[PDB]
Structures are given as structure tokens and as C-alpha cells.
Design a protein around this ligand. Structure first.
Ligand code: 48U
Lengths: 52, 230
């Protein structure tokens, strides 16, 4: 297991392989964090989050 | 939903309920955004005029939205139940709040490789709690394992197309049921829930050697994206 096959490339959400390296991305309503891996919500009710 | 558990506060905020003129629920849907609901194309034959309710977990205690545009897949047919998908644009936007929030739409390749390969998904709705019974007054959810495609085809009396997938149990008495159609099948990945299926059809509910059949959302991501732009 390598790149995206290895724990989702350490990405919070979407993982793709571009030129043999991990590229992370996020669903609409999230911004990719400075680390290029985490996904940070832009508002109070981001998609896919339980309201707890 | 047969078996499973009650959706507790905030646990299933993407659930939508399609209600007829008599304000009775007949099908589910999934909230995609403030203006859009995902449902099954077959649900659009179950009532002439309908509205969408969001935020309710208990149908016996007290937002209702009218539908502006109904977008049904033009290839859906009752003969095969293939292409069982529709998108609804609402007249007014949904206000997100506790118990009202959209499910995420995943990117296609990643969903196929990472979500559909997970052990389980979650189905939810206000459908019957037994094959013979009344609609549930409480929103319910159920963890359903993904079923191997070969096993799925073997067990079925009808053709399972590439726009469908199987989920549930062989003999364990848990499944979606009547009234749950059109509702969400979501898959959790790192505490984020992505829409992966639409409740479509089944040979009864929780029957031995039968599984629940769901519309494969990954097969329609481009179609959904286009439908959300007019
Ligand atoms: C071609 N084709 C597949 C058909 O024409 C077809 C069309 C309909 C049904 N049936 C038979 C009765 C059942 N109604 S239900 O109980 O409201 C739904 C229950 C659920 C169980 C788990 C799910 Cl996932 S949906 C249903 O969808 C069927 F078995 C076959």
C-alpha cells in the first residue's frame, strides 16, 4: 500500500495521485488546510456532519 | 426501517420526507444543499402533488418546502427499475439547523475506491418497521453491510444493473422497508457522511437470502452536478 492506498494518503477527504504523489481535496463548503490534508468547514452546517 | 435504531438528536440531519396532499410521508429523500433534494425516480409516481419536510424526527410533534422543479432521470423505467434517481429543486431554501444539514457528495473515483469498499453504510427513514405494519412515527437508521456483487446477483430474482448495489443482511432481520424508498444511504469516512446510495427496491423486507437494492450514486455524480445547475 502506497500513496492514496496508504491510509487515504493521510487526507481528511478526497485523495488523488498526481505525478506519483498524494493530492488531497475537500467537498464543497470545506477549504483545504495549510497542511494540504485537513478539511476545514467554512460555515456552521458543513455537509456530512451530524449536528451534535 | 426494520430493526436498527431511532435517529437520536442530530444524527441523521440530511433526511428529507416527501409528503402527500394529506401531509402523510410516502418516500424519503436526502438533503444535498439548501435548494436540492435527492430521491428515487419511482417515488414521483406515488403522489401527484407533494412537498418536502425536513428536520422532523417525530411525525407527531412540531420546515415544509414546496417543489419548484422535478428532475427525473429520463431513462428510468418500472420494467427494470434502472436509473432510479431524481433531483428536486425547492422554491425556498432550507435553513440548516440542528437536525437539518446536507450530506456530502463525494468525487466519483474516490467514492468507488474508498467509500464503497468500506464494511458498512447507513440507511435511514420513516418507513415501516415490519413488512406488514404502519409507517414509523420516528426516524430510524440502520447500519447495513455492503454486499459482494456476485452474492447480490445470485440472490436476486431480478437483474442487478451497474446502476445498483446491494446492502444489508442475508438472514439477520434488519432492512429498509416500505416508505423508506428515495431515502439516504450514506457512508461514514473520518466522521464525515457522504451520500452513496438511494433506497430503491427489495423483494419484501428483511427476507432470508434477499438484500436491499440501492441506486449507486457514484454512477450519477455528473448527472446530479448538472441537475443542480438549472
Ligand atoms: C425490476 N424490478 C426490480 C422490479 O420491478 C421490482 C419492483 C419492486 C419490487 N418490490 C417488491 C415489494 C417492495 N416494496 S417495498 O417493500 O416498499 C421496498 C422495500 C425495500 C427493502 C429494501 C430496500 Cl433497499 S427497499 C419492492 O420494492 C421488486 F421486488 C421488484
Amino acid at each position: 500500500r502506497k500513496l492514496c492506498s496508504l491510509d487515504n494518503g493521510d487526507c481528511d477527504q478526497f485523495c488523488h495521485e498526481e505525478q506519483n504523489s498524494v493530492v488531497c481535496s475537500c467537498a464543497r463548503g470545506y477549504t483545504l488546510a495549510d497542511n494540504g490534508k485537513a478539511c476545514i468547514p467554512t460555515g456552521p452546517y458543513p455537509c456530512g456532519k451530524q449536528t451534535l | 426501517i426494520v430493526g436498527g435504531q431511532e435517529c437520536k438528536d442530530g444524527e441523521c440531519p440530511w433526511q428529507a420526507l416527501l409528503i402527500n396532499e394529506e401531509n402523510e410521508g410516502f418516500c424519503g429523500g436526502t438533503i444535498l444543499s439548501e435548494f436540492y433534494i435527492l430521491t428515487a425516480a419511482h417515488c414521483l409516481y406515488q403522489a401527484k402533488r407533494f412537498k418536502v419536510r425536513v428536520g422532523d424526527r417525530n411525525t407527531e410533534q412540531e420546515a415544509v418546502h414546496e417543489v419548484e422543479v422535478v428532475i427525473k432521470h429520463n431513462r428510468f423505467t418500472k420494467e427494470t427499475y434502472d436509473f432510479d434517481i431524481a433531483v428536486l429543486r425547492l422554491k425556498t431554501p432550507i435553513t440548516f439547523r440542528m437536525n437539518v444539514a446536507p450530506a456530502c457528495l463525494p468525487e466519483r473515483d474516490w467514492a468507488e475506491s474508498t467509500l464503497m469498499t468500506q464494511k458498512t453504510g447507513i440507511v435511514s427513514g420513516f418507513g415501516r418497521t415490519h413488512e406488514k405494519g404502519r409507517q414509523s412515527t420516528r426516524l430510524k437508521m440502520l447500519e447495513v453491510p455492503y454486499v459482494d456483487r456476485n452474492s447480490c446477483k445470485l440472490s436476486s430474482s431480478f437483474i442487478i444493473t451497474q446502476n445498483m448495489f446491494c446492502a444489508g443482511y442475508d438472514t439477520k432481520q434488519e432492512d429498509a422497508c416500505q416508505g423508506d424508498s428515495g431515502g439516504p444511504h450514506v457512508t461514514r469516512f473520518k466522521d464525515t457522511y457522504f451520500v452513496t446510495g438511494i433506497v430503491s427496491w427489495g423483494e419484501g423486507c428483511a427476507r432470508k437470502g434477499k438484500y436491499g437494492i440501492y441506486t449507486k450514486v457514484t454512477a450519477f455524480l455528473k448527472w446530479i452536478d448538472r441537475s443542480m445547475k438549472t
